[PDB]
Amino acid sequence: EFGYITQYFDLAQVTLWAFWLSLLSVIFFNRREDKREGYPQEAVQIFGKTILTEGFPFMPAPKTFKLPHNGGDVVKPGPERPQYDFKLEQVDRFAGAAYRPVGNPMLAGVGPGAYAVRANKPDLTNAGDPRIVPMRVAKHFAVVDKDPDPRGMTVIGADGQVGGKVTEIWVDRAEPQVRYLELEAGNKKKVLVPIALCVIKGQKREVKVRSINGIHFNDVPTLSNYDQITLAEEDKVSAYYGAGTLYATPNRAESVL
């Protein structure tokens, strides 16, 4: 009879319902784990008052990370360290309007140039030593020939001008690889540039840094001690180079078409 039916309820049906309920429930738990960073959120009210809201579903109860080498406990969701001192002016009088920096945009720490407030300790290896270090402190590293050694090259800066010269390489001992280039700038300071913002040309013996301009290499943040770097300093350096992607030229933040 080709399509005769004996009974409407079967096992495939029930099992499908069970799956709909088993999904729909890992969504719940994952969405709750999503809110251990950045919450409670700030909802702005009808006439400017700000309250803390928590969303749907609600925030989870705090858990603890025990960091190694007596690096302390981290509770999440927990307290926050205080923001620094960014200045901003709103552009249009409603909660969803954008903001403008008030002073020199490069030295303001807002927009792509914002950074976080991390610990003032270096990241450690499994043995307790600082992880990112110059190649004169890590005496066992060597650049593989077949590859252009950047030490000596110049640091052209996106408008064609010279920034300085490369004098050191900063390596990562936990995973052997290059993280920073150190260079002497135009006013004879020592500044770092991340290796992921550098195009290295071996034959021209140049390093092109498209982010900032040549004269901008004088105001890159500096380090305390030059035998190690801390989490805070990493953030400051990288953020300064990221501010130039929108603030270097006055025409960069200005609608392509």
Partner: protein, 66 residues
């Protein structure tokens, strides 16, 4: 596939007439032998499956072509 089907006389049908488990006891190997014979039908005439079937139900006569 010609010995069992075009000289012998074996059943080509393999699918069931209801949706739940019933008296049908054909296997995947018998399904493979049928698939082989159908491949020859396609090659010998210059056509595809869809010259005589709608693939979403290879066993329904109300969804075949003339």
């Amino acid at each position: 596939p010609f010995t069992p089907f075009l000289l012998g006389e074996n059943e080509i049908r393999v699918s069931g007439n209801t949706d739940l488990r019933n008296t049908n006891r054909k296997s995947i190997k018998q399904a493979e032998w049928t698939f082989a014979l159908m491949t020859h039908f396609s090659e010998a005439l210059g056509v595809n499956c869809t010259y005589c079937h709608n693939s979403r139900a290879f066993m329904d006569w109300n969804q075949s072509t003339p």
